[PDB]
Every structure is written in structure tokens, then in C-alpha cells.
């Protein structure tokens, strides 16, 4: 009972690009996936159905995600309650007609540091593991021609739908697919982002190659992942959990990761941003009640996780497809 | 002591009347036996603030609302945490979100549209903390009795009943075998998450059938495997780290067993493969959960190499 999405505008937008053939089959693939996901989608429909009919008088996506319109107290209460029905909210924050979706992450802080290193104007962008799509909006704010996000999580998809309701003309799409669901050798995006995915992949090199295969020649990869201090030979694989997370594989040093990207065939490879993640930028909130960074750090030594491993440190590395 | 007089009144004139007239004495004795167990949770129950809801929703969720300041909410939260671990739920209790291990709300949404509970006398076998009992009233049930021989589950029900004291739901800390034979007094009986723990799945089905009036309905949920009518898994040792797991039939095998037990109009209404979004450790349930029980390299298997948890809901009628 979630409406089907009309992809005809996406098909129109991708005509005359290497993405055209793929776009021509997306409507069928999306329709099938949403049929199969009907049960899961029902979990969030009452929340989506309760979102009030409002249109922004003002939109900013360049310095934040902020939507403004004339909205009374009663309407704001309805909106706030509907949005809370889509919790937990991880990437953000979103300012939605005076409702502050105070998400787990200050994704805006990180974006602010990365964006000045990139020229997105006129580019077709893919965001891999996009979560709720927060960054897709910001990539439009930085001038992207179009942004497609992929993440096979229905709640993330519904959080994107909530925002797209109020931004229905903008060229951003969220596809509830895994990266492996894209065809081989798509080679159609100008820029690809993979933020927070590499450390969950058994095969980091295959991940890098899959991202390269998404890019046009001359395209750009922006890779963010968990790293450790040290030289080119230092690579951590946890015995069990890392910051209480399962399925954590390789945590290379920055020089190790740069070398792997060169072996995967990227050029102009360099780190643009490194930092230890702070409890100020990642924490539980009213909108994301579950445990968060502070809970996963050694309570006596914030430089270590509860397992005694080096605490979360993220690097952003940029490279080009030669 | 818990006063069962309103239950006795509610059941007068039904086939459950005679049994109800013996319940208070049985409960009192069971609670004597369980005194030592019950003491563990008394201070937490005693710490629950005196509050009464201004708004109650049991139909679309479990949500209770009232005027409550931060200091009372702090006391409420601490008391409720004293009853950890919380498995079935979630409960929204005056702004305190009991984020339980299970999204039992999701499962309820998959099951309830297939059932008509309006005006029915319902028994919930293996009710855990009684979450679904509240939802069954939300769905129009005249009354719900839950049975589960676990003292913590009993105390978790008491915690919610404190705030919903006039609703016709009761939790009995009994095993199904503690009910007399041939009660034949319920319109609908639920057995959710029990069959796989029974050495005798057929005796379980017959015991459930014996609780029902003629024309009554059994809602059966349990762990299953893929395959045809001949596929039946019994683990060599553990299944998803659990001891005492016996039969995991295929859906067609389970339907056949239900027909052999004498049910008619037997049909599977839901099949789902349990995900870590539906079952997980939380601040309210800190012990291990589903993600720890799956093969970390192949989530289609348990850590033992067996097919990963798959649940089926099957409905049948007593002829």
C-alpha cells in the first residue's frame, strides 16, 4: 500500500549517458523489489501516511538540510509525531518546518570538512550505503546534477521518502538495492561515495573494484572508513567485535588503505580528512534511543573501545579512475 | 496476593466456570512455591510510581500517556529496568520506552489481520510477559488469559497491569499441563514459540485442541525449515544456541501434523525469516540475541550450521 514510484523522470535524466540502458530497466526492478518488500514496508506506512501536506516556502541544502514554511503548532505536533514514527534516525540532522530531527550523527560536521575538496557541479553521483539519504540532499546542495543512493534497508528508504515528500522535484533517488544488484561494468557515474561500508566487507579489494566499475573513466571515488594509526603494514582485524559491532573486517592504516586503492587501480590517491570520532558527533538522542559511541568506548579511556582496541578513527580518501 | 474474583465473575456461566472457581487456590499455592523467585523483583515492583493513564492505545501499539514530570519518569525508568531482561514488546509507558529484544509489534501486525478476536475468550500459551494479551484486547477480545511458568514474565505483566488494572487480562504463572483436561472453554488459543520446545509436538497440539470450544481457532507459531512434507529437523545438540529444541518441521509437515491432531481448515498465513532488526540485544535486554546465534559468515545458517530461524503462523479450526 506504499505507492509505486514513477521513475520516468530518472530515465529522461539519464538518457544519452552510460547509465541509460540500466535506467531503462530500473522501474521493473524497483517495482519487483517493493512488491517483495511489501510486508516490511507496512511497518512504516502509518508514519508516512501521517505526514501533513506542506510545501516549503524556503529550502536550503547548501549549508544544512533546512525546510521552512508557514506551519502552526498543531500541524508541527502532527509532523513531529509522524517523523518520530520513523525512528531510529542515524544520518542528519534535518530541519523540517521547525522540527529538528536531532539524528544520532552530526553528518553535517563531517560533510562540511569533505565537500570543499570536491567539485560536484553538474556531476552524476552515486552514494553507496547512503543510509537515509541525508548526504544525497547535501550533494544536490553542492551542485550535483543528480544523485542516486543505494542501501538495502526499508527503514532508510522510508526516511528518504519522508523527505522526498517535501522535495518532490529534486533529482535524488534512493534505491533499496545492494551494490551487487547493479549490473557489471556500469561505468556511468562521475563521482561515487562509499562512506562507512569498507570495514564491513570481507573483501575490501573487491569493494574497491566494484566502486571503480561504477565510475566513468576520469571519475572520482570518495572513500570513508575506519582506520588505525601506523605505517603501510599496519592492519587490524578484530578477534570478535569492534566497538560492539559484528561483521567488522579490515581496519587498515591510512597508508595501507591508500596503497590498496592504488592496487585497485585508482590514481591521485590521497587522504583529505582524518579524525577520531567524538561523542559530540555521534550519540543517542530522542530520535535514536539505542546505544551509541559513548557506550562502546572504554569508560576509563576514550582512546580505546570496550574491547580495548584503538577507538574509532575515520579517514576520507579521494582517488580518480585513470 | 492477587485477587482473581473479577476473573471468576467474568467466567461465570461459561464452560470455564468450574476451573475458574479453583484458580485462586492454585495461584496462591504456586505463589508460595515461587516466593524465593518473586523476592528478586519485589523492590522493582514496589518502586513503580502511582500513575494512571489519561490515554491508552492497545490497538496499534502499547502506548500509555499521562502527565508525568522528569523526576517521576526517572523513578519509573529505574524501576522498569529492575525487571530486565525484557523480551516481548516494545512498551511505551508514559514516555519511558521499553525497547525490548523483540519487535513483537511487527509480528502482531502480520498475524492480527488474519484473525477475528471481537468478543472472544482467548488463551495465550507461553505468553512471556503478556505483551500480546494487551494487543489481543486492543483487537476486540472479550478476555485474555496467558499462561507461562516464568516468574520474571509474571512480574513484567504485573508491572503493566499496575497501570491497566481494570482490563480483562490475566497472567497465570502455570504450564499448559497445569490446566485440567477437556476445558473446551476458549474461542481462540495462541501457541507462539512453544512447539519447538516440546518433546511431543503431537501431544502439544492435542492439549491446545482440548482448550477450545467446538468451532474454536488455534493460532500456532513456531520455528520451521524449508522443504516438503517429509522434511523434519531435530538438532543433534543446540539450535541457535538453545538447549531443549526438538522438532523443526517444514510448513507442509506441520500442517499435516495439525490435520492428524484433528484440526480442520489448516492454513499457513505467514512465513518470515527472523532478522536482527526484529530480534536484538538492547539496553533492556543485554544478553545475547539473534545476531550472536547466526553463523557470522553465512546469515542463512545458525552457528551450528543449521538453517537460520524461520517462523510460520498456521491457523486451524476445531471441528
XYZ file of C-alpha atoms in Angstrom, chain A residues 65-191:
127
model
C 19.141 20.464 5.346
C 16.529 23.100 6.279
C 12.943 23.396 5.020
C 10.793 26.369 6.048
C 7.095 27.091 5.570
C 4.154 28.658 7.378
C 3.154 25.975 9.890
C 1.125 26.265 13.092
C 1.720 24.487 16.432
C -0.890 21.759 15.848
C 0.486 20.911 12.398
C 4.048 20.806 13.805
C 2.955 18.366 16.533
C 1.407 16.064 13.905
C 4.603 16.304 11.814
C 6.910 15.692 14.773
C 4.870 12.634 15.815
C 4.837 11.204 12.291
C 8.623 11.651 11.925
C 9.224 10.026 15.329
C 7.327 7.034 13.891
C 10.323 6.523 11.516
C 12.927 6.212 14.322
C 15.807 5.394 14.722
C 17.271 8.297 12.698
C 21.021 7.969 12.157
C 22.434 10.328 9.484
C 21.411 14.016 9.621
C 20.317 16.336 11.190
C 17.239 17.537 9.293
C 15.382 20.770 9.982
C 11.836 20.176 8.727
C 9.475 23.132 9.084
C 10.733 23.888 12.582
C 11.023 20.238 13.676
C 14.665 19.457 14.434
C 15.319 15.791 13.634
C 18.266 15.502 16.014
C 19.830 12.394 14.483
C 22.491 10.155 16.073
C 25.202 11.661 13.878
C 26.224 15.185 13.112
C 26.740 14.123 9.458
C 26.715 17.832 8.673
C 30.017 18.310 10.564
C 31.763 15.653 8.515
C 30.209 16.812 5.217
C 31.391 20.363 5.877
C 35.042 19.086 6.027
C 34.831 16.860 2.913
C 32.755 18.966 0.496
C 35.391 21.711 -0.082
C 37.769 19.040 -1.538
C 35.278 18.025 -4.232
C 33.726 19.639 -7.310
C 30.245 18.142 -7.668
C 28.809 20.758 -10.075
C 26.975 19.088 -12.965
C 28.109 15.579 -11.850
C 26.068 12.347 -11.718
C 26.695 10.975 -8.238
C 26.206 7.576 -6.647
C 26.122 7.225 -2.817
C 26.813 3.606 -1.759
C 25.418 2.671 1.677
C 23.572 6.009 1.679
C 21.564 5.289 4.858
C 18.502 7.567 4.894
C 19.950 9.639 2.046
C 20.956 12.705 4.077
C 24.125 13.140 2.038
C 22.250 12.903 -1.274
C 20.396 16.098 -0.373
C 23.657 17.770 0.561
C 25.304 16.621 -2.685
C 22.471 18.401 -4.569
C 23.207 21.380 -2.320
C 26.821 21.274 -3.560
C 25.669 21.404 -7.205
C 25.310 17.752 -8.292
C 23.269 17.169 -11.439
C 21.633 14.067 -9.934
C 22.268 11.697 -7.038
C 21.259 8.071 -6.678
C 21.729 6.344 -3.336
C 21.776 2.574 -2.791
C 21.024 0.933 0.550
C 19.012 -2.317 1.045
C 17.228 -1.227 4.239
C 13.498 -0.423 4.110
C 13.534 1.932 7.055
C 16.281 4.035 5.397
C 14.170 4.006 2.214
C 11.110 5.239 4.142
C 13.126 8.012 5.862
C 14.177 9.140 2.370
C 10.520 9.026 1.237
C 9.544 11.256 4.194
C 11.950 13.979 2.987
C 11.262 13.470 -0.709
C 7.570 14.160 0.054
C 8.613 17.797 0.654
C 11.265 17.944 -2.090
C 9.476 16.083 -4.866
C 11.039 17.915 -7.845
C 14.711 17.420 -6.897
C 16.821 14.893 -8.804
C 17.636 12.498 -5.941
C 16.586 8.831 -5.818
C 17.010 6.189 -3.190
C 17.131 2.614 -4.426
C 16.635 -0.122 -1.849
C 19.344 -2.261 -3.500
C 22.760 -3.605 -2.551
C 25.734 -2.524 -4.690
C 25.926 -6.133 -6.089
C 22.403 -5.587 -7.546
C 23.831 -3.096 -10.051
C 24.898 -4.559 -13.375
C 28.553 -5.285 -14.144
C 30.703 -2.516 -15.665
C 28.089 0.207 -15.292
C 30.836 2.871 -15.596
C 28.284 5.732 -15.558
C 28.778 7.927 -12.509
C 31.139 10.944 -12.331
C 31.578 10.559 -8.553
